[PDB]
């Protein structure tokens, strides 16, 4: 996930949530978004 | 649905069923999935 | 459209939920075509 473009990272966050994928997996995406922002 | 990529069909079915979309729209997706199998 | 990681998570979700077998075959077929058939 560190190698994803910002565009694909954010798109994956929305898609994961919309598809109701595993919540811990969704947390990993959130954590990558937070890492990039900090 | 015939020209949808398999990955857009996968995405569509999860989103449609999780979002409680029209059962007719879900049936269109379910029919195309079965057509492909 | 679906990242490798999203697709694999889709497989885990579909199998967990016991979704229709034709839907599981669709996901499996997309996994294989990406050379992730080793699951």
What domain count does chain A have? Answer: 1
The residue in chain A having the minimum alpha-carbon distance to the alpha carbon of residue B15 is A19
The residue in chain B having the minimum alpha-carbon distance to the alpha carbon of residue A20 is B18
Residue B1, domain member (yes or no):
no
Q: What is the CATH number of the domain that holds A26?
A: 1.10.287.1100
Closest CA to C10 of B17, B2, B23: B17
SS3 string of chain C?
Answer: CCCHHHHHHHHHHHHHCCCCHHHHHHHHHHHHHCCCCCC
Cα–Cα distance, B14 to B19 (Å, whole number) = 8
Cα–Cα distance, A19 to B15 (Å, whole number) = 5
C-beta atoms of B18 and A15 within 8 A: no
Residue C22, domain member (yes or no):
yes
Domain that holds residue B14: 6-36
C-beta atoms of C30 and B13 within 8 A: no
Cα–Cα distance, C39 to A5 (Å, whole number) = 25
């Amino acid at each position: 996930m560190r190698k994803l473009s910002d565009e694909l990272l954010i798109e994956s966050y929305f898609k994961a949530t919309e598809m109701n994928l595993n919540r811990d997996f969704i947390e990993l995406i959130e954590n990558e978004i937070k890492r990039r922002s900090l």
